Structure formats: structure tokens, C-alpha cells
């Protein structure tokens, strides 16, 4: 029963007709999947390793040098040699300086100097290449059945149980087919290779931390590097991003290797992403991942049993979670056995009809033990309602408020569609799929905006998202056309939205 | 290979207790849920009880549920079974039996290795 | 839904006998989790078919597995001398206690 009170929660709608479904298993938030006469199952993408790691570069960030010495040349000489320049270990700077008969030879003006320091780097930061190959993802699915509030305590603890059941999607074996003992097994048909693009995206480490960032952020910072084949002592190529060379004013050179500019990188590592290392694997999080989810071998466990005749007591209060569903724990009195647990709910109490919805879809009581508890989960109406449990008089019942208007929910329908949109982009319209021509005609046209937006606005930051919004819709509202003042309107509101979502 | 000794079995007065013992050995004992299976003399085997990969979750049969508990230590690598509230019915020889209950993918609810037993009475 | 089974089998060496278990709807009819396990007197059993059909490595082709209905069924062909010894079906139970084992067959090689 993982997915509960997550707040990043999803509900897909298995359509009659058809037994599979598209979802968008996003790492952080997580998806219930309830069909039409299935047991609900709610899924959530757990873990995303990366097995194989290739060192592709190492920066220095805490140089430090040791020997120095300096070569001068009279003027109308030559230049000065030092003998260290055919050292690769040191660095080296030709400036001129002034000379003259205080300095010790013939002429005057502009002698030939260099300054050579010993380079040595004290600390590393090492990236590495992440192919989209030999990556693992791992999926936590639970089904809304026996348990009751007590099992979702280290929901990190991936056990499987009759209850819960742990695939590991792979690019080599992306299709597994999930068992869930009594339920049947779900079938995913997942995407491994279109998740993060991790084709563009380092391991960067640094000091026992570690980071995912960009391929062009790794090979656009200035440091002294050496190519990850080097082994050894490594031959540091840009020794000169660490050491400034400075002369008296017209008279000598000093060497200075600068900081530790670890901060500086990490103020450099803005839009990056922490990660973690299992040991010798980039075990990570805020991925995605696209899957199809094939219901033939889901069906209801126990549908031939008989209701529960017996006391039900409330164990907790019903609890509202937030998306507007309130969750139910009962205890059974009775010790008939495995039985079907009578629940429902009515706005009158008279003509008890069924309103609203039920998560569960089949509460079930399997313990024969005299005081057992089980959970449930029901989507109640909007206004009051009453949340009865059991069949006969010694039923119990909860009076229930549900403030979310048809109208308010449609609005938080959109609004969560929207955030899904921009932080999936096209991915999005994968959510919801269950096939169709509009959506496919949606999903293609919106792929071709997002090329176009990301080939003029990629690089960009919140603040510069919302600078040039601003300014769009300036070049908006005040434009002679209405066709260019309708695109600068959208593209305006599109990159303010785009700034606020993440930031709201 | 892959072995199974089990460990305290022998004569215990009715309406006593006694604590099993089954050690693993070969494989990862840690992902795989075991179970328990017992066979009084002449008749036949019945499913006691099983423990899932890490103890988060028990099961027993409907003879024996109340009476015994079963539970598995990772580190050490052996699983154990608590008798409780014995008498005659619960003679037999207790059979520690490794099981692909929940593991990955799709199971079977079958019995791979079997330990050699430990006799109860 | 304690699933039963016959209780002894007699066949000769070089013929097929065929064992059978059946048992109510809350473990075969709408599960393939059944397994057959054969036990020699003094000895821990040994899983021969897994799945309904299914074969362990390391287990002879002469036993095969099916299930139609209510009753499930595993033929040994080509019986020898060795194969003496106890049979039992076990099955997954939508009810306490998950798993339940058959009555158990002695088989007899005549």
C-alpha cells in the first residue's frame, strides 16, 4: 500500500476496452493503476544505478607548487631558458623586464625573463562517461489488498511481499513480467533507453560527493585536466587556469597558485543533480522512466469469497490524503476467515445506494485470527457523505466532508498536467496514453515545439526565463500584427510558466 | 552446494516450547524467502509456515497460526522457528525448505533445496 | 481446500502411470502455481515439475506436468525400479494457509 499520502501521486484510469496502458514511472513521485474489475496497483520507480562507469577527464581544483626558479637574458640577447621548459611537470611564463647596468649587464631596456614553478595537485575531481546501456532500474509495485496501515514504514526497503513485488527494468531485459501472488502479474514494457538522455550527462566526484551533470558543462570548465587513460603521475594539461604569474614592476616575476575552488564549482554545479555511490555504481534519483503496462494476467484475488459477518471496529480515524481520498482502517471481530470486507458509501442512509468510487476495488479481510485489521482507500464525493462498513445493524459508520469541487479538481487536473508537461516536455502525453490519433498528433506536434523551443531558448536560466517572457509579452500585447503578437504572447507566457512551475 | 542443516529438534513434553534453528549456506540467504514444512510419520507433508526476504512478513498454515513463529536472521544466515503451546498434533520432523515465494519477476510458489529435517515430538 | 490425492499407485517397470491431484477453486482452477515433489522414505523431498509444466535442471524428461480444471495431473513414462516412493501436489491457496500440499501417494513399482 506504498503510493499513500505521497503528494506526488497519479491515478490512471485502465479505459474499458483494451488491456494495457502507458505511464511515465517519475522517479520521486508514483502512479495507482486501477481497472475495471483489477485489483489497483500502485507503482513507483525506486532506484536508477549506473553499472559501468568509463573516467573520461579529471580536473584540479587544489594545485599547489613547489620549486621555483627564474632565467633572465640581457636585453639584445636571446631569450632565457631555465632548462625547466622541457620539463612537462612544470609550469612556465616568458615576460620582459626591465635591465640595465644596476642589473648587471651592457644595455638598456626590456630583458627576456622566465619563471618556472613545480605543479602538483593535491585534489581531484574525477567525471565519468554514463552509457545508456548498463543501467538498472528498479520498481516498487503494491497492490491494494490484504495489508493494512503498518506495512508502508521504509517504504526504501524493497521486500517483496505477496503484496508487493520488485522488477528490475534493464535496456538488455526491459520486459518483465511482474508476479504478484494471488493478484496474477502486471506486464511492463518499459523504455530504459529514453529516460534522462544520461548520453549527455557525466558522474562528476568530488571530495566523497558526486553530481550528474551536463557533457558541455564538464568540458567547458577551465582547470588543469589530464585525460582519464593517464595513470600514474598524471601530466596536467592547463597548468596555467591555477597558477598566475605576476611581475615586480618592472623588475622581477612571482609565481601564485590560486584557491581550493571547490567553491566555485560547487556555485558552478547550480542546475546539476546530487548522486550517490553504492560502491562501485552511480545509484541515483530524479529520472523517468516510460513504461507499458499490460493487465491480462491481473484479476481480483477474491472474488468468490463470501462478506464478512461480523463487528467491524475503526482502528484510526478515516484520514484524508491529498488528492481528495480518504483512507479507512477496520478491525474484524469475526474469525469465519478469508472474507470479503462490505464497504461503501452513501450521502442517505436510507436508501443506501453507492456513491462515489473505491480504490481498493476488493477490501478483503485473510486473516482467520479473531482480531485482525485491514485498509482501504475510497474516493468519496464532493460535499458530506458516510463512510458504513459491514453488511447487517452492527455496522459502523464515519461522517465524511469532501471540499474538492468537480470544477476545483479539474483545475488541479490541469495544473498537475501542466508541471508533467514541463518537466517531461513531450514525455507527458505518454501518461495518460492508452493509444489514439489525437494524442499521437498531440505528442508529435508538441515534439516539434520543444525541438524548436530548445534550439532557442536551451540555455537558459529561472531569471532569464523570466526576463525574456517579459519582454515577450511586451513584444506581445504592443505589436502592430496580431499574428506575431500571438506568438510572442505565447512564447512569453510559455517561458514565464516554464519558470514559475518549477518554482511554484 | 547449496545446504540446509537444521538444528534443536528432538523430545519435548506437551504443552511445552522449543526453538528450532535452520542454517543456509551457498546461496544469498538474504533474497530468498524460506519456508516450512512438516511431516508427521506416515502421513503426509504440509506447509507450515514461511518468512519473506528480510522478515517483514509471516505466514502460517491454519493448524498452526497463534502457535509458531517463524524468523530469520540475515547476518548469521540462519532462519528459525519458535514452538509454542505444543502438543501431540505438532509431532512430526520439520523440514527447512528454501522458496522462490517473492523474488523477481515470475514465481511458482515452489521449493528449490530442502534441509535434511529435525524430528519433534 | 486441502487438495487430495490417491492413495496408492501400482505399475510396472517400462509403462506410464499417471498420478493425479485435484482440489477445490481456491488453489488450482485459476492458479498454474503447482508443483510436484516426490520424498523417499528417510529422505527430504525433491521438486520435479514447477508451473503446471516446468522442469527443474537436473530432473529426467520422463515426468511432465498439466492441469485442465479442477484436477491437475503429472505422468512418469517410462517407469524404473528408483522411482518407488511418495508423490505430493502442491498448490497456492487464496485463503489461510497459502500454500497447501495433496494427500500424498505412495507409489509402488511392481
Known amino acids: 500500500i506504498r503510493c499513500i499520502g505521497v503528494s506526488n501521486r497519479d491515478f490512471v484510469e485502465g479505459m474499458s476496452g483494451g488491456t494495457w496502458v502507458d505511464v511515465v514511472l517519475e522517479h520521486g513521485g508514483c502512479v495507482t493503476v486501477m481497472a475495471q474489475d483489477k485489483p489497483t496497483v500502485d507503482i513507483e520507480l525506486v532506484t536508477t544505478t549506473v553499472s559501468n562507469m568509463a573516467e573520461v577527464r579529471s580536473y584540479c581544483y587544489e594545485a599547489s607548487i613547489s620549486d621555483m626558479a627564474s632565467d633572465s637574458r640581457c636585453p639584445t640577447q636571446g631569450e632565457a631558458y631555465l632548462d625547466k621548459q622541457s620539463d612537462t611537470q612544470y609550469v612556465c611564463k616568458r615576460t620582459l623586464v626591465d635591465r640595465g647596468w644596476g642589473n648587471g649587464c651592457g644595455l638598456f631596456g626590456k630583458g627576456s625573463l622566465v619563471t618556472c614553478a613545480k605543479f602538483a595537485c593535491s585534489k581531484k575531481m574525477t567525471g565519468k562517461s554514463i552509457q545508456p546501456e548498463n543501467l538498472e532500474y528498479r520498481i516498487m509495485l503494491s497492490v491494494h489488498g490484504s495489508q493494512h496501515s503498518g506495512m508502508i514504514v521504509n517504504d526504501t526497503g524493497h521486500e517483496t511481499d505477496e503484496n508487493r513485488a520488485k522488477v528490475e527494468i534493464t535496456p538488455n531485459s526491459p520486459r518483465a513480467e511482474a508476479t504478484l501472488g494471488g493478484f496474477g502479474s502486471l506486464g511492463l514494457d518499459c523504455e530504459p533507453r529514453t529516460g534522462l538522455d544520461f548520453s549527455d550527462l557525466y558522474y562528476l566526484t568530488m571530495n566523497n560527493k558526486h553530481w550528474l551533470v551536463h557533457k558541455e558543462w564538464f568540458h567547458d570548465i577551465p582547470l588543469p585536466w589530464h585525460a582519464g587513460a593517464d595513470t600514474g603521475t598524471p601530466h596536467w594539461n592547463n597548468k596555467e587556469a591555477l597558477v598566475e604569474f605576476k611581475d615586480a614592476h618592472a623588475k622581477r616575476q612571482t609565481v601564485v597558485v590560486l584557491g581550493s575552488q571547490e567553491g566555485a564549482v560547487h556555485t558552478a554545479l547550480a542546475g546539476a543533480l546530487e548522486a550517490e555511490m553504492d560502491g562501485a555504481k552511480g545509484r541515483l534519483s530524479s529520472g523517468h522512466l516510460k513504461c507499458r503496462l499490460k493487465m491480462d494476467k491481473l484479476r481480483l484475488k477474491g472474488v468468490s469469497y463470501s462478506l464478512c459477518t461480523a463487528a467491524f471496529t475503526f482502528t484510526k480515524i478515516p484520514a484524508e490524503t491529498l488528492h481528495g481520498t480518504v483512507t479507512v482502517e477496520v478491525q474484524y471481530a469475526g474469525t469465519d476467515g478469508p472474507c470479503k470486507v462490505p464497504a461503501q458509501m452513501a450521502v442517505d442512509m436510507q436508501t443506501l445506494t453507492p456513491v462515489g468510487r473505491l480504490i481498493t476495488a476488493n477490501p478483503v479481510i485473510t486473516e482467520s485470527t479473531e482480531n485482525s485489521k485491514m485498509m482501504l482507500e475510497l474516493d468519496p464525493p464532493f460535499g458530506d457523505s458516510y463512510i458504513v462498513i459491514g453488511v447487517g445493524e452492527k455496522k459502523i459508520t464515519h461522517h465524511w466532508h469532501r471540499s474538492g469541487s468537480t470544477i476545483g479538481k479539474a483545475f488541479e487536473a490541469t495544473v498537475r498536467g501542466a508541471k508533467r508537461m514541463a518537466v517531461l516536455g513531450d514525455t507527458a502525453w505518454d501518461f495518460g496514453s492508452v493509444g489514439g490519433a489525437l494524442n499521437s498528433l498531440g505528442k508529435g506536434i508538441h515534439q516539434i515545439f520543444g525541438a524548436a523551443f530548445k534550439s532557442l531558448f536551451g540555455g537558459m536560466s529561472w531569471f532569464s526565463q523570466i526576463l525574456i517572457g517579459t519582454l515577450l509579452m511586451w513584444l506581445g500585447l504592443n505589436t502592430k500584427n496580431g499574428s506575431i503578437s500571438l506568438m510572442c504572447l505565447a512564447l512569453g507566457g510559455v517561458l514565464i510558466f516554464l519558470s514559475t512551475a518549477v518554482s511554484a | 552446494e547449496v545446504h540446509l542443516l537444521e538444528s534443536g529438534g528432538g523430545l519435548v513434553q506437551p504443552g511445552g516450547s522449543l526453538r528450532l534453528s535452520c542454517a543456509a549456506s551457498?546461496?544469498?540467504?538474504?533474497?530468498?524467502?524460506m519456508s516450512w514444512v512438516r511431516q508427521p510419520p506416515g502421513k503426509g507433508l504440509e506447509w507450515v509456515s514461511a518468512?519473506?526476504?528480510?522478515?517483514?512478513?509471516?505466514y502460517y498454515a491454519d493448524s498452526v497460526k497463534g502457535r509458531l513463529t517463524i524468523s530469520r536472521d540475515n547476518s548469521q544466515n540462519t532462519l528459525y522457528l519458535q514452538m509454542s503451546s505444543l502438543r501431540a498434533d505438532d509431532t512430526a520432523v520439520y523440514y527447512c525448505a528454501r522458496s522462490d515465494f517473492w523474488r523477481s519477476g515470475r514465481y511458482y510458489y515452489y521449493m528449490d533445496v530442502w534441509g535434511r529435517g529435525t524430528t519433534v515430538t | 481446500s486441502a487438495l487430495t490425492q490417491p492413495a496408492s499407485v501400482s505399475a510396472s517397470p517400462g509403462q506410464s502411470i499417471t498420478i493425479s491431484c485435484t482440489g477445490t477453486?481456491?488453489?488450482?482452477?485459476?492458479?498454474?502455481?503447482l508443483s510436484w515433489y516426490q520424498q523417499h522414505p528417510g529422505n527430504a523431498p525433491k521438486l520435479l515439475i514447477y508451473?503446471?509444466?516446468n522442469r527443474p535442471s537436473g530432473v529426467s524428461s520422463r515426468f511432465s506436468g498439466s492441469k485442465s480444471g479442477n484436477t491437475a495431473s503429472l505422468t512418469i513414462s517410462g517407469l524404473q525400479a528408483e522411482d518407488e516412493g511418495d508423490y505430493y501436489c502442491?498448490?497456492?491457496?487464496?485463503?489461510?494457509?497459502?500454500?497447501?500440499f495433496g494427500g500424498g501417494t505412495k507409489l509402488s513399482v511392481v
Open positions: 551457498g546461496f544469498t540467504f538474504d533474497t530468498y524467502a
Open positions: 508451473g503446471v509444466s
Open positions: 502442491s498448490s497456492y491457496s487464496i485463503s489461510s494457509t497459502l500454500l497447501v
Open positions: 518468512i519473506s526476504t528480510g522478515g517483514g512478513s509471516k
Open positions: 477453486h481456491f488453489d488450482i482452477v485459476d492458479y498454474d502455481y
